[PDB]
Structures are given as structure tokens and as C-alpha cells.
């Protein structure tokens, strides 16, 4: 694994171009996330 940019704890991928996209985020230490919910699902075929 690579390190965080100096003085930072994470990277925020701010979406440009695609006006509808939300952000992505990257952390570099696994202890900075906890898996609270496991969601089991299917994608639905559109009508």
C-alpha cells in the first residue's frame, strides 16, 4: 500500500465532467474504515 499525501488522512476524488457523479474516497490505512452493514441484493432489469 501507498501512503497518504503529507498532512492528509485520505484522498477525495471530486468528480468533474460528469455533473451527476458523486465523490469517491481513498484511505491508506485499513483501520480508518469499519464495515457496519453487509447488504445482500440483486440488480433489477428495468421495466
Amino acid at each position: 500500500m501507498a501512503h497518504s499525501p503529507p498532512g492528509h488522512h485520505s484522498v477525495t476524488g471530486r468528480p468533474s465532467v460528469n455533473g451527476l457523479a458523486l465523490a469517491e474516497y481513498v484511505i491508506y490505512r485499513g483501520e480508518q474504515a469499519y464495515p457496519e452493514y453487509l447488504i445482500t441484493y440483486q440488480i433489477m432489469r428495468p421495466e
Binding site: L20, A33, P46
Partner: protein, 161 residues
Amino acid sequence: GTILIDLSPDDKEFQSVEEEMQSTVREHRDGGHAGGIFNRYNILKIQKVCNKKLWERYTHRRKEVSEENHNHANERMLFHGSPFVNAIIHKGFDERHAYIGGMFGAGIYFAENSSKSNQYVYGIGGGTGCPVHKDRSCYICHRQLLFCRVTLGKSFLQFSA
């Protein structure tokens, strides 16, 4: 250490999690190649993941970050998709759930869009699709995403035009 506790569909906590899956689906620029063609999900089950030792590992790091950042953890609830969900819920996130080829270098990726995390359920770019039918748009096979508490602290802002 890990225990999975089912949430009833009647629980307001089931509801608010499902509302966050459903309401963060968007259309993707691949037309569906990676994650399939859909506008919404059929939610089959939601389980609360309970591991004391992993939780303490999380809160310990959270306190460090918070004290490095004027008592602001910058904690979010984000989605994560991966074929190693079952290892993550038993052993935690570490460098073997890094995405080394990613847009922002090698680390662990999370998304506000549920549908973005869905592109990664069967691997990078969706891999070869579901194990049973080899179909990145499978409408039958059960998929799994994590909804995760993430400490961002001070976040490096990268623009992606």
C-alpha cells in the same frame, strides 16, 4: 470475533440504509458494461456486522485522526464493493483490499454512489461477471456491498476532469 445480526425490514435502520443504496444509483459512462443495466435494486437482506476488536481498532485510529484535525474525524458512511467482502467482515480492511491500479493510487476505495461500488462487486471492471453465469449484468445472482463508517480526517481534494 465477527457476528452478523439481521435487520428486520420494519426496522427504521433497515429503511435508512436501503434508502441510501437506492437513492445513490446513477447511470454510468460505461452504459452498464462493468456493473449491469439497472435503475434500482431488490434488497434481499441487511446485516449489522459486529466485531468488538475490529470496532476498537477503528475507534482507536479515529481518535488519532480526530486529534490531528481539531477534534474532527470527518466520518462518513460510504459504500464499498469487492469480491473479498467475506474476508473484510472477518479480518478487517488492510493492503490486500487495496486497488493498486486506481485513479488515486494504491489504497482502499469507497464511493458515495452505491452503483459505483456495484461495478467492483465481481472485480475490477466487473471482472468476468457472476461466478455462475459469467454475466456482469446478472439479474439472478445475489450480490453483496458493504456500507462502511470511514474516517476521512483532513482530505486531499483531487479534481477529475
